[PDB]
Amino acid sequence: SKGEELFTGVVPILVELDGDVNGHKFSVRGEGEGDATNGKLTLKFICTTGKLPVPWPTLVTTLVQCFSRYPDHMKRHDFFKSAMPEGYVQERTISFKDDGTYKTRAEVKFEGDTLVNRIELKGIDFKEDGNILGHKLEYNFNSXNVYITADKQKNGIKANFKIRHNVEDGSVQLADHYQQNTPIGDGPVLLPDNHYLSTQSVLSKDPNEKRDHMVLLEFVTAAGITH
């Protein structure tokens, strides 16, 4: 409820990613706003280093589950907000079928009134003319359920889930996600019963923007608990 108090209105968001994929360095900066009451967020991302060396859709999951709308009966299961304002570390491995792997580490926390997601990403073993480095993925993103379970040993949560990116030739590229979150502070956190997060994502372009970029709208809502 203390953490959850921080999210009662519209919250500015800042995202910073420093990326290295097959030795190719890049940076992304994102800004916008989040409304956890309605499970909604709006963000625009820029590759500040020039051309992004991987496809924007492959970065969506990496680029703030604290903005999920948790219904009233499920408030006691919201680990993400309970960890605020000190925040949580979020780590993944993302394994692209027949291609490379991303490893990510992020800290998601308040800095003043701004929720900040600061990420480091390392990608290795990518095929230089595969779907990823060859930019063969459609500019879109499907709806997914991300199943959350408690990890009481790490006093946090975990999740594994499959993302399926559409490829331009009509096939699909699997990206297998394993995720772990752990609180940054020592204060008490909420450890949840099993549930999931239903996310929809809409990608677009700003017709006035000349930099390499992604405009993102998402709606996220928690569900699957009864009593």
Residue numbers in the entry: 2 to 64, 68 to 231
According to the publication:
H148 plays an important role in defining the fluorescence properties of GFP through the contribution of the imidazole side chain to the charge transfer network that modulates chromophore protonation state equilibrium, and maintaining local structural integrity. We have demonstrated the versatility of genetically encoded phenyl azide chemistry to positively switch protein function through two different non-native PTM events: photolysis and bioorthogonal modification.
Two molecules comprise the unit cell with overall structures of the two being very similar (RMSD of 0.33 Å). Photoreaction of azF148 induces conformational changes in the protein; shifts in backbone and side chain placement coupled with structured water networks are likely to drive excitation switching on photolysis. The backbone shift is critical in allowing WB access to the β-barrel in light state sfGFP148azF; the two waters, along with the phenolic oxygen, make up a potential local H-bond network. The crystal structure indicates that the T203 side chain retains the same geometry in both the dark and light state sfGFP148azF, placing it in a different orientation to sfGFP.
